[PDB]
């Protein structure tokens, strides 16, 4: 694949099927499987990065609690609090070191998360 | 401060307290139950 000029997962996911079928030893089923794997890998990388910081996964799950700005969602996800369930399981003491989060604001967000996860 | 103060609080009130998780609430119930006490008396 690299000798045929493919360097990125994006090229393999999006390039016209004809160019991948010009490679010696690729059949239409194997090209389809390779593209599906490349798209699934790109989706897994996009989900992984979105959960590590606050791009989409933590910008929706961890940010469900009313009051969570995108910056706070990424600060939470940097501590491994990636979902609204992960936030509902925290104590105030576990979040006390997050810059811009007061004990009162931490307590309000944990209670909002618990109200949605455990009482919704 | 006292066991008599704890026994008067409801489970819903204890979940509002700061640094109070679902795990610590289950621990408090299991310990009170071992002494024949329940929350909300």
SS (H, E, C) A71-97: HHHHHHHHCCCCCHHHHHCCCHHHHCC
Distance, in Å, from the CA atom of A82 to the CA atom of A57, rounded to the nearest integer, reads: 7
Distance, in Å, from the CA atom of A72 to the CA atom of A75, rounded to the nearest integer, reads: 5
The half-sphere exposure of B30 on its side-chain side, counting CA atoms within 13 A, is 6
Q: Is residue A10 part of a domain?
A: yes
| C-alpha gyration radius of chain A | 21
Same domain, yes or no: A106 and A74: yes
Distance, in Å, from the CA atom of B21 to the CA atom of A88, rounded to the nearest integer, reads: 8
Distance, in Å, from the CA atom of A56 to the CA atom of A27, rounded to the nearest integer, reads: 36
Task: Record the tokens describing residue B16, joined without a space.
Answer: 């509002």
Method of determination used here: cryo-EM
Q: Is residue A56 part of a domain?
A: no
Please give the angle made by the CA atoms of A20, A25 and A28, to the nearest 5 degrees: 50
Residue-number span of the structural domain to which A104 is assigned: 70-119
Distance, in Å, from the CA atom of A25 to the CA atom of A28, rounded to the nearest integer, reads: 10
Q: Is residue A63 part of a domain?
A: no
Number of domains in chain A: 2
Same domain, yes or no: A41 and A8: yes
CB-based contact, B19 to chain A, within 8 Å: yes
Q: Is residue A76 part of a domain?
A: yes
The residue among B14, A66, A90 whose CA lies nearest residue A76 is: A90
The residue among A31, A32, A39 whose CA lies nearest residue A9 is: A39
Measured between beta carbons, which residues in chain A are less than 8 angstroms from residue B19?
Answer: 91-94
Same domain, yes or no: A1 and A45: yes
Measured between beta carbons, which residues in chain A are less than 8 angstroms from residue B23?
Answer: 89
């Amino acid at each position: 694949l690299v000798e045929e000029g493919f360097s990125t997962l994006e090229e393999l996911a999006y390039v016209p099927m004809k160019e991948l079928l010009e490679i010696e030893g690729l059949d239409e089923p194997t090209v389809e499987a390779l593209r599906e794997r490349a798209k699934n890998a790109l989706a897994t990388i996009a989900q992984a990065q979105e959960e590590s910081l606050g791009d989409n996964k933590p910008a929706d799950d961890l940010l469900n609690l009313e009051g969570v700005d995108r910056d706070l969602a990424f600060k939470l996800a940097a501590r491994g609090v990636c979902t609204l369930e992960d936030l509902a399981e925290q104590g105030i003491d576990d979040l006390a070191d997050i810059e811009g989060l007061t004990d009162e604001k931490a307590g309000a967000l944990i209670m909002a998360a618990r109200n949605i996860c455990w009482f919704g | 401060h006292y066991i008599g103060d704890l026994v008067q609080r409801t489970e819903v009130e204890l979940l509002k307290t700061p640094n109070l998780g679902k795990k610590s609430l289950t621990e408090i119930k299991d310990v009170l139950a071992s002494r024949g006490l329940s929350l909300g008396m």
